[PDB]
């Protein structure tokens, strides 16, 4: 649960470049032999993605900002990658989405999970039947308030170590739209020494997850190794295999999706990357002929908003009204018409010079930005017990017999000691 790894060491977030990764089907609509333009959360091409790896003295399980979406890519031999943890706090304080492949099936659950320092899954003591099936469940300590659960088809996961180059490539897309989560998957074999292969790929939906929970951070789970021969302290003395995974960020960019005869995407264009890409996007074609074309219009954005209103002087004497030598009786309350002047309400409402202040129908802050038609002030003095009678739909010696406020009264009430 909370036991820290012995050999884990922190490393700076190194970055690497992605050629064309981040391309996925925006929806389930089918299109073939056409070039479609769409704008959605995409990973810009030739962008920078975090460079992380897992070895026996650097173990990478960092926390990264989910933002509006992220992209995943990793090269594997034994498929060290286990899953991910998603949530705003990744603790029981709120709900967290988790995806775990525990050697039998993909499990997706929405509950209140207890956060762990180094959550992960592993196996131990394989011996003479390779197995590699989930042994311990350190992902979370407990769960409660479960609102969603999903199970995929059973399958056998091969975690056996292999030599040579990286034979597997797994890429996933994590995104959030109005709380509706979309997950995309893609898997191909590769022959890679380091970094990522040079090519193109198209990711496809894996599951639909209409959950609706805010996620601002996430973690990457890794699978470690254990044996009868060289174990360690629980669970600090456990080690994991060699693997590398990369994490990107999705932005609302527009791509030109080139669909083949079978509907599979064979090429993509990121408009913002290259002025040639902008030319293609404007022409809505994947080929640009020699010449000069108009793509868009450049403009200079304002530095800041500047407001220069006229002088608010010539204010009517509200201060004199509230500080006048004498006031009229409650039954003889004076009705005074205020017009042909400006009102500065900042000094009145926000000075905290009055015992009580309330408004009916409109908040005091909004009134400062509104222009009225007629304004009236009724000044009177009443006893403390009678102050509560000054409100819409009231009764009593003052509300009924002296001064009554209509139920639709949109004004404010001011009183002080």
């Amino acid at each position: 649960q909370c036991v820290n790894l012995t050999t884990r060491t922190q490393l700076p977030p190194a970055y690497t470049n992605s050629f064309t990764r981040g391309v996925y089907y925006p929806d389930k609509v089918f299109r073939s032999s056409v070039l479609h333009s769409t704008q959605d959360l995409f990973l810009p091409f030739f962008s920078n993605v975090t460079w992380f790896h897992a070895i026996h003295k650097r173990f990478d399980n960092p926390v990264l900002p989910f933002n509006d979406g992220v992209y995943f890519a990793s090269t594997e031999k034994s498929n060290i990658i286990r899953g991910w943890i998603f949530g705003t706090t990744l603790d029981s304080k709120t709900q967290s989405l988790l995806i775990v492949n525990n050697a039998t099936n993909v499990v997706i659950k929405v509950c209140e999970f207890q956060f762990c320092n180094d959550p992960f899954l592993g196996v131990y003591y394989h011996k003479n039947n390779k197995s590699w099936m989930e042994s311990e469940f350190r992902v979370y300590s407990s769960a409660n308030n479960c609102t969603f659960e999903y199970v995929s088809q059973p399958f056998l996961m091969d975690l056996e170590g292999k030599q040579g180059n990286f034979k597997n490539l797994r890429e996933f897309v994590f995104k959030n739209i109005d709380g509706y989560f979309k997950i995309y998957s893609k898997h191909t074999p590769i022959n890679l020494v380091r970094d990522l292969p040079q090519g193109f790929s198209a990711l496809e939906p894996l599951v639909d997850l209409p959950i609706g929970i805010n996620i601002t951070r996430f973690q990457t789970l890794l699978a470690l190794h254990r044996s009868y021969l060289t174990p360690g302290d629980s669970s600090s003395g456990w080690t994991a295999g060699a693997a590398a995974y990369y994490v990107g960020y999705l932005q609302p960019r527009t791509f030109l999706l080139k669909y083949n005869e079978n509907g599979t995407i064979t090429d993509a264009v990121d408009c913002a990357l290259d002025p040639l890409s902008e030319t293609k996007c404007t022409l809505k074609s994947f080929t640009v002929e020699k010449g000069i074309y108009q793509t868009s219009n450049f403009r200079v954005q304002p530095t800041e908003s500047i407001v220069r209103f006229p002088n608010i002087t010539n204010l009517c004497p509200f201060g004199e009204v509230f500080n006048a030598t004498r006031f009229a009786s409650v039954y003889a309350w004076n009705r005074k018409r205020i017009s042909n002047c400006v009102a500065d309400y900042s000094v009145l409402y926000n000075s905290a010079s009055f015992s009580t202040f309330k408004c009916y129908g409109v908040s005091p802050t909004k009134l400062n930005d509104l222009c009225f038609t007629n304004v009236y002030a009724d000044s009177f003095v009443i006893r403390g017990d009678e102050v509560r009678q000054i409100a819409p739909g009231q009764t009593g010696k003052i509300a009924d017999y002296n001064y009554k406020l209509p139920d639709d009264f949109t004004g404010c009430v001011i009183a002080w000691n």
């Epitope: 649960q1 036991v3 131990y124 003591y125 394989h126 011996k127 003479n128 197995s131 042994s135 311990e136 469940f137 350190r138 254990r226 044996s227 009868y228 021969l229 174990p231 360690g232 302290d233 629980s234 669970s235 003395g237 456990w238």
Partner: antibody, heavy 119, light 113 residues
Framework: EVQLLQSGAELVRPGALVKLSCKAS????????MHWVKQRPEQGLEWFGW????????IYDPKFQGKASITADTSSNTAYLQLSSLTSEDTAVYYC????????????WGQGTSVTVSS | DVLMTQTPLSLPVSLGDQASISCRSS???????????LEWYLQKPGQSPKLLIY???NRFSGVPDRFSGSGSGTDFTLKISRVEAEDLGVYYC?????????FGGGTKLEIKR
């Protein structure tokens, strides 16, 4: 010095349940596996299962699968065993072990407990 | 589920003689790395079983140097260099690792007279 303490003995009727405690001393219960054993005069030793207090996963001998559940208390540093639907055949001496370092090179045993199931 | 058989049921050995206890397993317990998974337990009179050897090739800490095991495959044997009066008890074999653990039939020891 690592040592495990258990109750001296228990007496229970058929069909009821018996709860046993194996206390941990000299080591942290969290980071070390746990084990249980059954000894009979004729059949010698017979195995029960293992539990990891950190994980809580348990595996039971096909003979006793579904007949017992194993639990542990991290705060009290004591491992708990529970048996349900007891019968005459369950009369035997029970032993507890653990302290493995996630390894077979180290394990320890308590003095054991004698449980008799009769009316 | 694995089955073990032990022979002989009991054997006498004087102070200073050599004792031989063998165990058999129905399945191979050796793996690719070449090491063996097994433990030896001894239950003295009025006392609980105690570990003697682990992995068959390494002695447990605090155990007398006379206790040592050897063998390969599913057939092993426990070697005691010089048996003492404190060795009275029943010897057992144990399969560890991740599998329903199995016990042996037991082997009693005594001093000839």
């Amino acid at each position: 010095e690592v040592q495990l303490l258990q109750s001296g003995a228990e007496l229970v009727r058929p069909g009821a349940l018996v709860k046993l405690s194996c206390k941990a001393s000299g080591f942290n219960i969290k980071d070390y596996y746990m084990h249980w054993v059954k000894q009979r005069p004729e059949q010698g030793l017979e195995w029960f299962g293992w539990i990891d207090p950190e994980n809580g996963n348990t595996i039971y001998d096909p003979k006793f699968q579904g007949k017992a559940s194993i639990t542990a208390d991290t705060s009290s540093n004591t491992a708990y065993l529970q048996l349900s639907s007891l019968t005459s055949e369950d009369t035997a001496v029970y032993y507890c072990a653990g302290s493995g370092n996630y390894e077979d090179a180290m394990d320890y045993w308590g003095q054991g407990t004698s449980v008799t199931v009769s009316s | 589920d694995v089955l073990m058989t032990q022979t002989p049921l009991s054997l006498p050995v004087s102070l200073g003689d050599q004792a031989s206890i063998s165990c058999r397993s129905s399945q191979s317990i050796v793996h690719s790395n070449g090491n063996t998974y097994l433990e030896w337990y001894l239950q003295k009179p009025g006392q609980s079983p105690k570990l003697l050897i682990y992995k068959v090739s390494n002695r447990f800490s605090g155990v007398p140097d006379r206790f040592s095991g050897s063998g390969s495959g599913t057939d092993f044997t426990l070697k005691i260099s010089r048996v003492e009066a404190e060795d009275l008890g029943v010897y057992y074999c144990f399969q560890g690792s991740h599998v329903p653990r199995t016990f042996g039939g037991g082997t009693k020891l005594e001093i000839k007279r």
